[PDB]
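FORM 12-B: Structure-to-Sequence Request
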């Protein structure tokens, strides 16, 4: 609910537009400033982070940092932000955990005010109240942010999907979303990542079923390559390993921090004595182990090339091994997969083929996005989290749902959307850019 009569709204993207990552969206209501996410981008073509010079010059007015989910595209730059500025950090139980770990990992001694929020939390400020709602993503406890103004709600979806099989901390708040919609949404800021792809995602249970049928035929050792970010896909192989009386080992010699924190907080459903350390692998027959190679940048692929070319520090591929790629390939990574496949074949490994009829994504396709648009019914729309072609795609979806085209804004980094109370205008441009580290 609303506090006072507001005058000025400003919306400034410093990251996540005209590119696919580095989420950072500034929202101002009068004299108060809020930062929605603080992602990094893995330089394609270490890391890249947004230019926050605009924020620093107006540091006095930054009331909070709001973090939608635990991925590096949301919270990857937070440590670097907190070095230059002191503001309170708001996020879910899991998101705060992962941020704190990033701070511990960088040996940063700065004292930080962390506020754990949930879909029942309602954070109060001078000009506005902020609420939250659960979304569906590849990681549990993902939140949408709802900034309540006199003009209506400013909603930032974060990254989201709509899957009728995900039903835990992965489940969405369709009633809280419908209520936000009818109370009236002034502005919607939504994920455009798969806005070009017609229809829907393949449901996760369908993907799991096809993985099961594939893995059940494997007579030898099985190695699965995954993104560490994709908690669902990891949960899926744990389920399958258990039903096939196989045991699971990650690449060594300890367990991946994100996975291991979430595991210790009870986010994974793991039976007893299912994980064996990589040091205990040799003891078991080849057909009783599933090895999972996780990573972030695209190492998941690199690791298999190093396992094929003998040449892995820990463990190498043997003839009769089965390989499965439980990832979704960026066009930048299509060639290195084809090299790796060749080397896998030479080393005499069986390639479990991906079903081409399956579409796996953390992000909603056209119909999923239209779903959020139909629910929200925003007056103004700002498609983000995509390149220019993706933003356009999302805009056409919005126009179809009945948002006025005059009220849809396609913006670049540093663009400033202002609302006087009469007209919404793109009238300014501020300092923005890419800081490589
Ligand atoms: Mn994500």
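FORM 12-B RESPONSE
SEQUENCE OUT:
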């Amino acid at each position: 609910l609303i506090k006072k009569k507001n005058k000025d709204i400003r919306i400034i993207p410093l990251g996540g537009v005209g590119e696919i990552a580095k989420n950072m969206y500034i929202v101002e209501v009068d004299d108060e400033m809020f930062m929605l996410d603080a992602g990094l981008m893995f330089p394609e073509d270490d890391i890249v982070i947004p230019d926050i010079q605009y924020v620093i010059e107006n540091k006095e007015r930054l009331k909070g940092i709001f973090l939608t989910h635990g991925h590096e595209h949301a919270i990857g730059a937070v440590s670097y932000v907190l070095e230059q500025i002191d503001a309170p950090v708001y996020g879910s139980k899991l998101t705060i955990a992962l941020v704190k770990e990033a701070m511990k990992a960088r040996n940063i001694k700065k004292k930080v005010r962390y506020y754990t929020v949930n879909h029942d939390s309602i954070m109060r400020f001078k000009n506005v109240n902020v609420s939250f709602f659960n979304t569906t993503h590849s990681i549990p406890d993902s939140l949408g942010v709802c900034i309540h103004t006199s003009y209506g709600s400013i909603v930032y979806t974060g990254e989201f999907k709509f899957d009728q099989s995900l039903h835990g901390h992965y489940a969405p708040d369709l009633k809280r979303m419908a209520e936000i919609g009818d109370e009236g949404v002034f502005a919607l800021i939504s994920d455009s990542t798969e806005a070009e792809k017609p229809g829907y995602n393949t449901p996760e249970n369908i993907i799991e079923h096809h993985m099961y049928d594939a893995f059940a035929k494997v007579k030898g050792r099985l190695i699965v390559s995954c993104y560490a970010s994709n908690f669902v896909r990891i949960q899926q192989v744990l389920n399958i390993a258990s039903q096939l009386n196989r045991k699971v080992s990650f690449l060594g010699r300890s367990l991946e921090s994100s996975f291991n924190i979430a595991r210790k907080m009870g986010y994974f459903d793991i039976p007893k004595d299912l994980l064996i350390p990589i040091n205990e692998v040799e003891n078991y027959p080849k057909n009783e182990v599933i090895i999972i190679a996780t990573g972030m940048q695209g190492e998941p692929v690199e690791a298999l090339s190093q396992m094929a070319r003998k040449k892995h520090k820990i463990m190498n591929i043997e003839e009769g091994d089965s390989i499965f790629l439980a990832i979704t390939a960026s066009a930048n990574m299509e060639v290195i997969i084809a090299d790796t496949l060749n080397e896998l074949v030479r080393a005499g490994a069986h390639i479990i083929p991906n079903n081409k009829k399956i579409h796996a994504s953390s992000h909603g396709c056209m119909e999923e996005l239209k779903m959020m648009l139909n629910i929200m019914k925003p007056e103004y729309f700002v498609p983000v989290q995509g390149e220019f072609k993706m933003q356009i795609a999302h805009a056409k979806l919005a126009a179809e749902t009945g948002v006025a085209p005059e009220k849809i804004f396609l913006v670049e980094k540093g663009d400033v959307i202002s609302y006087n109370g009469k007209d919404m205008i793109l009238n300014e441009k501020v300092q923005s850019g890419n800081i490589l580290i």
